[PDB]
Amino acid sequence: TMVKQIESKTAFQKALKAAGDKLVVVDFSATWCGPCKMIKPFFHSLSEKYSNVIFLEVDVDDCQDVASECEVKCMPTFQFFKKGQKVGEFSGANKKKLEATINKLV
Ligand SMILES: *SCCS(=O)(=O)O
């Protein structure tokens, strides 16, 4: 259990800076979203397998402001960060592409 919930743009930007030189994975999801429910367990399992990666969760229903600014059109969308920079992104509950993108950027 290493996934921290992001409830604000304040928290988001604080979390990104707190990350330092570590890869940051953000899961944009919703509670009513089927594909999101499928991959949620795996996303969380990945958090305590990739200890040198920072895992975050954003509920797009709570943070409609942030989801817009981040250009989430559908979920789950996964967005990847290093320093203060977006270094990767895909949308889809694709277990294979998620771990692959983690490895291709850590
Ligand atoms: S996903 C982050 C959007 S913004 O705050 O960097 O513009």
23-47: b or e for each residue (b if 16 or more CB lie within 10 Å)?
Answer: bbbbbbbbeebebbeebbeebbebb
Q: Is the CB of 36 under 6 A from ligand 1?
A: no
d(CA 17, CA 72): 21
- SS3 label, residue 37: helix
Does the beta carbon of 71 sit less than 6 angstroms from any atom of ligand 1?
Answer: no
Residues labelled catalytic: 33, 36
Helices (DSSP H) in the chain: which residue ranges? 9-18, 34-47, 64-69, 95-103
Resolution of this model in Å is: 2.5
CA of 17 to the centre of ligand 1 (A): 13
DSSP state of 76: S
| Angle formed at CA 21 by CA 57 and CA 97, multiple of 5 degrees | 50
Domains, the chain, ordered by start? 1-106 (3.40.30.10)
Q: Count the neighbouring beta carbons within 10 Å of the beta carbon of residue 58.
A: 26
User: Taking the C-alpha atoms of 100, 59, 10 and 79 in order, what is their torsion angle to the nearest 10 degrees?
Assistant: 20
Dig out the tokens for 96 from the structure: 């294979």
Which three-class secondary structure state does DSSP give residue 103?
A: helix
Residue whose Cα lies nearest atom 7 of ligand 1: it is 69
What residues does 51 pair with on adjacent strands? Answer: none
**What is d(CA 96, CA 100) in angstroms, rounded to the nearest whole number?**
6
